[PDB]
mmCIF file of C-alpha atoms in Angstrom:
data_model
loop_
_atom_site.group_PDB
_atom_site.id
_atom_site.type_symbol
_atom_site.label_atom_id
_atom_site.label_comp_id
_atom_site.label_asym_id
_atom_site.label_seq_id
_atom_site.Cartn_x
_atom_site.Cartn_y
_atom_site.Cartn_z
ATOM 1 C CA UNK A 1 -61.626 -47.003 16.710
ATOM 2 C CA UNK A 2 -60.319 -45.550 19.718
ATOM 3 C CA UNK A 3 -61.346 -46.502 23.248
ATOM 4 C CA UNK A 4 -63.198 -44.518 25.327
ATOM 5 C CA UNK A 5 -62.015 -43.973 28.525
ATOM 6 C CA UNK A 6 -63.844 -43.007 31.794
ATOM 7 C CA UNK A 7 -62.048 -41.358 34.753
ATOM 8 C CA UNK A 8 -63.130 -39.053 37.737
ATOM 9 C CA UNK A 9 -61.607 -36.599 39.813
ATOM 10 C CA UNK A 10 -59.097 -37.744 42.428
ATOM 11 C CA UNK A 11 -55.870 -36.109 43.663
ATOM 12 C CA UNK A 12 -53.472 -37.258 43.426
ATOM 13 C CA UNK A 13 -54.506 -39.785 40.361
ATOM 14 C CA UNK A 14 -56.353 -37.344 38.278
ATOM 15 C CA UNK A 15 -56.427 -33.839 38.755
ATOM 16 C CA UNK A 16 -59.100 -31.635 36.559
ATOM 17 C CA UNK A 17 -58.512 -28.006 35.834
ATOM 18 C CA UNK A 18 -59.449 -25.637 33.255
ATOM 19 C CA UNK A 19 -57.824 -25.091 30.227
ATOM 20 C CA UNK A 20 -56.403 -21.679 29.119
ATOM 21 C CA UNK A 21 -58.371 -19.280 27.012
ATOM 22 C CA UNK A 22 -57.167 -20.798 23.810
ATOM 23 C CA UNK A 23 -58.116 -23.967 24.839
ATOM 24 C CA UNK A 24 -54.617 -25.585 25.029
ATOM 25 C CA UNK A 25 -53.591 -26.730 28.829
ATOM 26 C CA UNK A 26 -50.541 -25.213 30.899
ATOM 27 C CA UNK A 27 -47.200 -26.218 30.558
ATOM 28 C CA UNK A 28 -45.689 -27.008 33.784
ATOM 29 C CA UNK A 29 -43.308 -29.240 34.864
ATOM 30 C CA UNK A 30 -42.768 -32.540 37.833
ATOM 31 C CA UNK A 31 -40.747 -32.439 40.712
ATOM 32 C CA UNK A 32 -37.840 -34.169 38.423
ATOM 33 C CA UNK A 33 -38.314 -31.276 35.817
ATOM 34 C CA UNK A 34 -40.224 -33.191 32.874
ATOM 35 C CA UNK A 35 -43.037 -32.035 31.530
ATOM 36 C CA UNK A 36 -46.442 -32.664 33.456
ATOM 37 C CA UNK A 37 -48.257 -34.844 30.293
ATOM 38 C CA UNK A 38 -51.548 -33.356 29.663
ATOM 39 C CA UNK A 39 -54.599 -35.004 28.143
ATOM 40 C CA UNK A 40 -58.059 -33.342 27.327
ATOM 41 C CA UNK A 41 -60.933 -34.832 29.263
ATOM 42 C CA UNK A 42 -64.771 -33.820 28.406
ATOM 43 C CA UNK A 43 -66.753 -33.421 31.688
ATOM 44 C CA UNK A 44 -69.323 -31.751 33.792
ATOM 45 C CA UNK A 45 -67.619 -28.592 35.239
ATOM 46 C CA UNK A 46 -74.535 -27.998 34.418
ATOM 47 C CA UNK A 47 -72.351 -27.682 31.601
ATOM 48 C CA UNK A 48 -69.734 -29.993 29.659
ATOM 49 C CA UNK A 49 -66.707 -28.999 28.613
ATOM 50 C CA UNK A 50 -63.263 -29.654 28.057
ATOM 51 C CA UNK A 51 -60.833 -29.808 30.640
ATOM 52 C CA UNK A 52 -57.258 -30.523 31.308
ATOM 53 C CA UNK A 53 -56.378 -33.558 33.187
ATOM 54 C CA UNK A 54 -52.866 -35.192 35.198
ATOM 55 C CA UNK A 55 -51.937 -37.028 37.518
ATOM 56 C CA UNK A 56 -50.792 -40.629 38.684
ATOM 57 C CA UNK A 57 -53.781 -42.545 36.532
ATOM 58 C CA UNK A 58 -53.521 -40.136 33.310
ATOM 59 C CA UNK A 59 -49.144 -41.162 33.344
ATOM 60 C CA UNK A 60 -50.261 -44.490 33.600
ATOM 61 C CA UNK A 61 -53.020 -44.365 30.480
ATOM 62 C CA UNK A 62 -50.617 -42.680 28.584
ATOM 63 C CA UNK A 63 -48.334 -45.766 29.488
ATOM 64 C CA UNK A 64 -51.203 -48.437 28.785
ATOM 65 C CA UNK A 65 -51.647 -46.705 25.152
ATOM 66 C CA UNK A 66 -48.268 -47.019 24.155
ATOM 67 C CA UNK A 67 -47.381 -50.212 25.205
ATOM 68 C CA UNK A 68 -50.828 -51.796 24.065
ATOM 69 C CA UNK A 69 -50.886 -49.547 20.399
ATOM 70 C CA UNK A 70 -54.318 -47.915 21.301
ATOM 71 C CA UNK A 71 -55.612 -44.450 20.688
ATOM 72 C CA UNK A 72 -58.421 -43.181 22.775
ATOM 73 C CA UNK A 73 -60.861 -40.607 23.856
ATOM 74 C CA UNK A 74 -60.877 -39.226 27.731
ATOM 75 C CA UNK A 75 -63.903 -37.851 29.617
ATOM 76 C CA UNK A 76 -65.150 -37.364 33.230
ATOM 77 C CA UNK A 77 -67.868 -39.675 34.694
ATOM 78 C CA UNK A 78 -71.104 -37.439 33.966
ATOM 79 C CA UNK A 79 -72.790 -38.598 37.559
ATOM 80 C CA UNK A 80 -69.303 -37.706 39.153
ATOM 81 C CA UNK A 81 -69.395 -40.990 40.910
ATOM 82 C CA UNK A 82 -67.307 -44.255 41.193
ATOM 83 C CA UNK A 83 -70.375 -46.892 41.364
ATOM 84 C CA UNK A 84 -72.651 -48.736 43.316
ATOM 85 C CA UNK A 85 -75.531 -50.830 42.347
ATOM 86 C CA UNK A 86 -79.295 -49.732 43.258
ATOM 87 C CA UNK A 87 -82.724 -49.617 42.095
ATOM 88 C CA UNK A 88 -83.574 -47.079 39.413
ATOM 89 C CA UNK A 89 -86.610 -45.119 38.550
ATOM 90 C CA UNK A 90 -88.580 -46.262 41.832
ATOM 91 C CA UNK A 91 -88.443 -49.819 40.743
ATOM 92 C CA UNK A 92 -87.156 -52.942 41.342
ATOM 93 C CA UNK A 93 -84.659 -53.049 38.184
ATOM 94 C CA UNK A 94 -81.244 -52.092 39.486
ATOM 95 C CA UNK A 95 -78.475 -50.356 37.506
ATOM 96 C CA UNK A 96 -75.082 -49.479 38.455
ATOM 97 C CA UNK A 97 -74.286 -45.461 38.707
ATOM 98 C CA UNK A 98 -70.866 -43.942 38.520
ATOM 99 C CA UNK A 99 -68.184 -45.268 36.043
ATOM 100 C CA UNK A 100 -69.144 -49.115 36.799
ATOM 101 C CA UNK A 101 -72.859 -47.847 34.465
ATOM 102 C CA UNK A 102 -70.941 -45.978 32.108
ATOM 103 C CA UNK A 103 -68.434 -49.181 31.450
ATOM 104 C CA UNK A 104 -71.259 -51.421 31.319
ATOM 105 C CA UNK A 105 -73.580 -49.097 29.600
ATOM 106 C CA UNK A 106 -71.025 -48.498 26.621
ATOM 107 C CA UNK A 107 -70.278 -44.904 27.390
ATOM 108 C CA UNK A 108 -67.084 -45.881 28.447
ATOM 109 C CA UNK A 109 -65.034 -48.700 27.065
ATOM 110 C CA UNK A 110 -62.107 -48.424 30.178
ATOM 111 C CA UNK A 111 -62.025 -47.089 33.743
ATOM 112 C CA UNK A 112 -58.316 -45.546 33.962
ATOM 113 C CA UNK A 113 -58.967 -44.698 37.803
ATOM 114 C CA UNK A 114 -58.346 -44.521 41.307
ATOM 115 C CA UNK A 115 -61.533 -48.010 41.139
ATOM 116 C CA UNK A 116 -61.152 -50.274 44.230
ATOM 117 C CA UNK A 117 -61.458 -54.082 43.258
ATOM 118 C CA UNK A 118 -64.045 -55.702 44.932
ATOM 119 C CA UNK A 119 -65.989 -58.370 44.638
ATOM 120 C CA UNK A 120 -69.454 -57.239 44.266
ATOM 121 C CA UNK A 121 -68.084 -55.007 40.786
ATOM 122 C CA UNK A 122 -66.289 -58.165 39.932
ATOM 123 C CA UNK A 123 -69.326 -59.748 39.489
ATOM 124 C CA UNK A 124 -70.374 -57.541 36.431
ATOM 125 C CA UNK A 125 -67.076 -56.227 35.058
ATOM 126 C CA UNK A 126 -63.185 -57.497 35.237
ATOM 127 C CA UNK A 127 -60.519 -55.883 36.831
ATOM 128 C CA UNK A 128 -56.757 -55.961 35.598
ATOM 129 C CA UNK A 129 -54.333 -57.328 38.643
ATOM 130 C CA UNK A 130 -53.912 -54.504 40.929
ATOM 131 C CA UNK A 131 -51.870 -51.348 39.574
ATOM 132 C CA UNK A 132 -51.843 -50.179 42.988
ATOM 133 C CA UNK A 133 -51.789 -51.412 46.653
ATOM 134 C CA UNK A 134 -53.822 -49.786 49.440
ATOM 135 C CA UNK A 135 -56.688 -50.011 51.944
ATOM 136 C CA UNK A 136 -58.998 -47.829 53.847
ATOM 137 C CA UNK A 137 -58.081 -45.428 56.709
ATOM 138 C CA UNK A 138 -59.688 -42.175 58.453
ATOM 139 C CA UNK A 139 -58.599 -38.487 58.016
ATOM 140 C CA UNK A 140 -59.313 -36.428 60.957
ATOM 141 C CA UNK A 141 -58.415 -32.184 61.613
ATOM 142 C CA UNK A 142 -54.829 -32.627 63.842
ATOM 143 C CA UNK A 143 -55.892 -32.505 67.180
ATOM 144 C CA UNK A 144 -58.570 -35.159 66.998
ATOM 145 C CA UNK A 145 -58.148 -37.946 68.856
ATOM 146 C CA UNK A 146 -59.823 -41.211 67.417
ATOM 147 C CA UNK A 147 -57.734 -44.580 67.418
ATOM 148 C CA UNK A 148 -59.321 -45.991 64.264
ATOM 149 C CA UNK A 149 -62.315 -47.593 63.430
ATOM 150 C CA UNK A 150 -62.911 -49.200 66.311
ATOM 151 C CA UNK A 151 -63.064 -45.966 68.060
ATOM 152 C CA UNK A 152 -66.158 -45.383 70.588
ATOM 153 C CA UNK A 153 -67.455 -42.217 68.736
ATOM 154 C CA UNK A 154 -67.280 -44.020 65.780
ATOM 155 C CA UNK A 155 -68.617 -47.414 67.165
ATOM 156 C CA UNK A 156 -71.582 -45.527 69.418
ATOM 157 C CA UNK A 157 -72.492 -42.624 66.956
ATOM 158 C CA UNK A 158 -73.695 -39.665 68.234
ATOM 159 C CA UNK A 159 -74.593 -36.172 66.459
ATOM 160 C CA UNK A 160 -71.596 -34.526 68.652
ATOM 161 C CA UNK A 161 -69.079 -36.166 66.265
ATOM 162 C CA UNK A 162 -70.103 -36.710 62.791
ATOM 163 C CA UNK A 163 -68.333 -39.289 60.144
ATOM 164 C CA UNK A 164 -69.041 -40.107 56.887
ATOM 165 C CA UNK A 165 -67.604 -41.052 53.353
ATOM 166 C CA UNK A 166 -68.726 -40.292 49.940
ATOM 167 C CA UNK A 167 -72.300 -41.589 48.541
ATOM 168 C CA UNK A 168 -71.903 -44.297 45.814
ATOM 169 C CA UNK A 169 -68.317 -45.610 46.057
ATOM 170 C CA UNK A 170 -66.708 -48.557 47.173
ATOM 171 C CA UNK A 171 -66.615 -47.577 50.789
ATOM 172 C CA UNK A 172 -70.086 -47.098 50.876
ATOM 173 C CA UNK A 173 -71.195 -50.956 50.241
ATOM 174 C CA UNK A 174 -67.999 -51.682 52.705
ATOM 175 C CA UNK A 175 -70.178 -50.614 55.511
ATOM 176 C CA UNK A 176 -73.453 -51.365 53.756
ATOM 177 C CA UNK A 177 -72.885 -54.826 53.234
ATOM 178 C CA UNK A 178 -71.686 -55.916 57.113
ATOM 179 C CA UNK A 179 -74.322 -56.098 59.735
ATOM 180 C CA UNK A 180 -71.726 -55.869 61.903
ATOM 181 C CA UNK A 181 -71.406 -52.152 61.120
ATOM 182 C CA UNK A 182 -74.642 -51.468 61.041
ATOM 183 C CA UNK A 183 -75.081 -48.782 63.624
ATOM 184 C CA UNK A 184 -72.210 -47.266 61.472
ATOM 185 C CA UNK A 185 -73.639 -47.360 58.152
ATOM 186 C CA UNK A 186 -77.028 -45.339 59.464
ATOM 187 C CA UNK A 187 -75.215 -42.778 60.720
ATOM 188 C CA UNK A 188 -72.724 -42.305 57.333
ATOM 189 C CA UNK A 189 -75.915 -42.424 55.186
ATOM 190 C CA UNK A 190 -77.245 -39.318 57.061
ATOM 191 C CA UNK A 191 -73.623 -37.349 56.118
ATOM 192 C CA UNK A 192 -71.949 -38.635 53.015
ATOM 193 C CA UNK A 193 -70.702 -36.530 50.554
ATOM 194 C CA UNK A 194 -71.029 -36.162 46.897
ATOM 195 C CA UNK A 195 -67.285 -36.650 46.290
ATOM 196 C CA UNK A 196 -64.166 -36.721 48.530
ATOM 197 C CA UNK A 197 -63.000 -33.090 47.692
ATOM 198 C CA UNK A 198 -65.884 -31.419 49.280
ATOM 199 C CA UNK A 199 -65.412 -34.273 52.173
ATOM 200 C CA UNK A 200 -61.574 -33.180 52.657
ATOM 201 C CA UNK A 201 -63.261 -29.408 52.769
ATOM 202 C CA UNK A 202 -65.699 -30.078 55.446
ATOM 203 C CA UNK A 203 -62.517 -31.836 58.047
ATOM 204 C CA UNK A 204 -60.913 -28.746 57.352
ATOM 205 C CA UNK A 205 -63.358 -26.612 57.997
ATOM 206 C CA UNK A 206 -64.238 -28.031 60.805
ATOM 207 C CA UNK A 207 -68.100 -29.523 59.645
ATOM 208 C CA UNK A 208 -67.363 -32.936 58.997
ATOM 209 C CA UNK A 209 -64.812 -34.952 62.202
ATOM 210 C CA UNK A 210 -64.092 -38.341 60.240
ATOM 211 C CA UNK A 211 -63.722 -38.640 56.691
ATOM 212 C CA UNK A 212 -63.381 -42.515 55.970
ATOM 213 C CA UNK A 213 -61.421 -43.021 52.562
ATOM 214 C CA UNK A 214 -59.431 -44.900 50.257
ATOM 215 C CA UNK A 215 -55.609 -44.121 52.006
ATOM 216 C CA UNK A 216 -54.001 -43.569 49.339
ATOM 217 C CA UNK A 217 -55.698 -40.412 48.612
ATOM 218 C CA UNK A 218 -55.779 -39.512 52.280
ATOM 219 C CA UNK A 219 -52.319 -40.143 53.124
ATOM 220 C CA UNK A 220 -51.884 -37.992 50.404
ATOM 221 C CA UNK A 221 -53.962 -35.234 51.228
ATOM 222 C CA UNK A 222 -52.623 -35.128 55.160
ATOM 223 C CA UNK A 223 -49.297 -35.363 53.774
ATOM 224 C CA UNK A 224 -50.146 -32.238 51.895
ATOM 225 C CA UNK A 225 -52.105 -30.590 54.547
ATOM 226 C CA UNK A 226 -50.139 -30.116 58.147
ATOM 227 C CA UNK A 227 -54.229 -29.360 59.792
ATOM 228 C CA UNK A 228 -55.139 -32.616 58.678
ATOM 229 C CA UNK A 229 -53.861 -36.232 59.909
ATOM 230 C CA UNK A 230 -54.541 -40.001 59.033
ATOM 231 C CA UNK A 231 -55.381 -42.326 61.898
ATOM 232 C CA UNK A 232 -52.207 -44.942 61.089
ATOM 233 C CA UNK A 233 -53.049 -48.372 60.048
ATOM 234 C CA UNK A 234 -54.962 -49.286 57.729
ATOM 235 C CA UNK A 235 -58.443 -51.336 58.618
ATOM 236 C CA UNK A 236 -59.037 -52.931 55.592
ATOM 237 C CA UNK A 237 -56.280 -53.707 51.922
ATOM 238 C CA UNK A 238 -57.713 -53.294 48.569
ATOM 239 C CA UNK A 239 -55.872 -52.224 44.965
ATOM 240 C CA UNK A 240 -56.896 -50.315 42.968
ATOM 241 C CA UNK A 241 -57.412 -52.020 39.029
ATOM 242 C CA UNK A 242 -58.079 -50.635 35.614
ATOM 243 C CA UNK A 243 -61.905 -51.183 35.111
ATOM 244 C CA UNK A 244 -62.983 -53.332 31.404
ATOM 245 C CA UNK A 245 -66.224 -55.227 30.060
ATOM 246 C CA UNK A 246 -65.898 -58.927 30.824
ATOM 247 C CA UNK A 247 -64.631 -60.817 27.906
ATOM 248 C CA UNK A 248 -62.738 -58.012 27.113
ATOM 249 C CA UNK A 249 -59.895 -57.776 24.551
ATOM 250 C CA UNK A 250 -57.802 -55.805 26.761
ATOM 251 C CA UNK A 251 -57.861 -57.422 29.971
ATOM 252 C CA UNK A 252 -54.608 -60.105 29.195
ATOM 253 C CA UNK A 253 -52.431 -57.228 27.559
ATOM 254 C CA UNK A 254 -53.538 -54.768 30.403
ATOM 255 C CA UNK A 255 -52.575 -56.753 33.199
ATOM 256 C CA UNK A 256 -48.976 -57.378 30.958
ATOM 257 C CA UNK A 257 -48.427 -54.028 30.976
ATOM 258 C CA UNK A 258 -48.819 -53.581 34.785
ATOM 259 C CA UNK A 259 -46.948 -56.708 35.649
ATOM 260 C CA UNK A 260 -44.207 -54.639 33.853
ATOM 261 C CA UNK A 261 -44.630 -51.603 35.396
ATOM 262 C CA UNK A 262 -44.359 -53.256 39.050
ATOM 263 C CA UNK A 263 -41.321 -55.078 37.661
ATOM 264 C CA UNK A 264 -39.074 -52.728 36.014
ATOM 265 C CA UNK A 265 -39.706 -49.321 38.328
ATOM 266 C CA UNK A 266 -42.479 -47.172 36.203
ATOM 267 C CA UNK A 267 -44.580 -47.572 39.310
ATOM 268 C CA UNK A 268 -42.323 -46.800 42.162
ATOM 269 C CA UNK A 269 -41.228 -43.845 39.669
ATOM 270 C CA UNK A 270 -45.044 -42.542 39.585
ATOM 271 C CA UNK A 271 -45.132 -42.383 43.168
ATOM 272 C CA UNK A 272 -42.007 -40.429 43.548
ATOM 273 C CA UNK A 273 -43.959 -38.036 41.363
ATOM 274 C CA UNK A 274 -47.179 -37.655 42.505
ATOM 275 C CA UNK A 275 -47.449 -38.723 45.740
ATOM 276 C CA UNK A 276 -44.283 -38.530 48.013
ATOM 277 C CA UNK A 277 -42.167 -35.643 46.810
ATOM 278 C CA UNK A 278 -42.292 -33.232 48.972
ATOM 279 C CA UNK A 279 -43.764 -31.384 52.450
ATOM 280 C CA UNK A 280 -46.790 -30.142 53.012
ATOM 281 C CA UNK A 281 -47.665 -26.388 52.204
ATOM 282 C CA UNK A 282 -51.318 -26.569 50.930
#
């Protein structure tokens, strides 16, 4: 009876880490001094196994199960991807990867996630109203001097400065789906990574110049990290949405419940908590 509900990796809306060798997870404690709420998500760490998960999305879920009298069942997208649509077996049938499959699939019965709304997902799932507000901006090693997108290393792509994002996410189709950006797109699809950890990594280290991402993880992670800087202003606005089947059962009492939260403070109180609290020391 209870839901099963998909999520993925993302600081600082889900973190993933090991639980302790009895299998419970560490007690620690927010910036306000409550206790970080824990839930136990089943994922790849290969091998499957239980880990502990946090964070921005997992407060909210908590939040959703309350107010909507639901119990549930949490695990980590298997491909470690958010989805995009392609062909499948070297044919012409096309399925969607990431947690859009699992959703549609049946493996999953909710996306609680950092999921940007757009419209070609829209077509094949619905999305609660927005439970977040954001866009799309570049993260760069401080000392790198791009203006934004519309930079001319970034707009005449060249193997002296390499860009990319990660490989089956929303970003991806951004680019793939403009001719305009064309010239951009070829050059990403030779460098994206498998997820935006290891694309964070490779700024810092120096192996990767322009990591183009959702900004509220990277003005999160630069805010963390004094090496590494955002470009500014945002090129593009999306939100982020809770993920369901259409003709769902949940979809009217799950956008309630985030109406509320934007209304009465449990939002602006998450970000206090996990994403502007303090300086950067990481």
């Amino acid at each position: 009876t209870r839901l099963k509900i998909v999520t993925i990796h993302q600081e600082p809306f889900v973190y993933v880490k090991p639980t302790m060798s009895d299998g419970t997870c560490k007690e620690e404690f927010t910036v306000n001094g409550d206790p970080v709420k824990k839930v136990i998500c089943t994922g790849p760490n290969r091998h499957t196994v239980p880990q502990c998960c946090y964070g921005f999305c997992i407060d909210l879920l908590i939040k959703l199960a309350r107010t909507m009298n639901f119990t549930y069942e949490v695990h980590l997208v298997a491909d470690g991807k958010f989805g995009t649509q392609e062909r499948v077996n070297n044919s012409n049938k096309k399925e969607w990867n990431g947690m859009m499959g699992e959703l549609l699939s049946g493996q999953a019965d909710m996306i609680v996630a950092p999921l940007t709304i757009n419209t070609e997902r829209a077509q094949y799932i619905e999305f609660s109203k927005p439970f977040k507000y954001q866009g799309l901006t570049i993260l760069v090693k401080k000392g790198t001097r791009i203006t934004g997108i519309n930079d001319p290393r970034l707009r005449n792509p060249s193997d002296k400065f390499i860009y990319a994002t990660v490989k089956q996410s929303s970003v991806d189709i951004y680019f793939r789906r403009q001719v305009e950006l064309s010239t951009m797109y070829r050059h990403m699809e030779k460098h994206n990574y498998e997820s935006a950890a290891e694309a964070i990594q490779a700024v810092r280290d120096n192996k990767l110049h322009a990591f183009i991402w959702d900004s509220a993880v990277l003005e999160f992670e630069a805010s963390q990290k004094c090496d590494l800087v955002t470009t500014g202003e945002l090129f593009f606005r999306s939100g982020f949405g809770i993920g369901m089947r259409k003709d769902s059962p949940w979809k009217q009492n799950v956008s309630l419940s985030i109406l509320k939260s934007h209304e009465n403070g449990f939002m602006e109180d998450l970000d206090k908590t996990w994403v502007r609290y303090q300086e950067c020391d990481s």
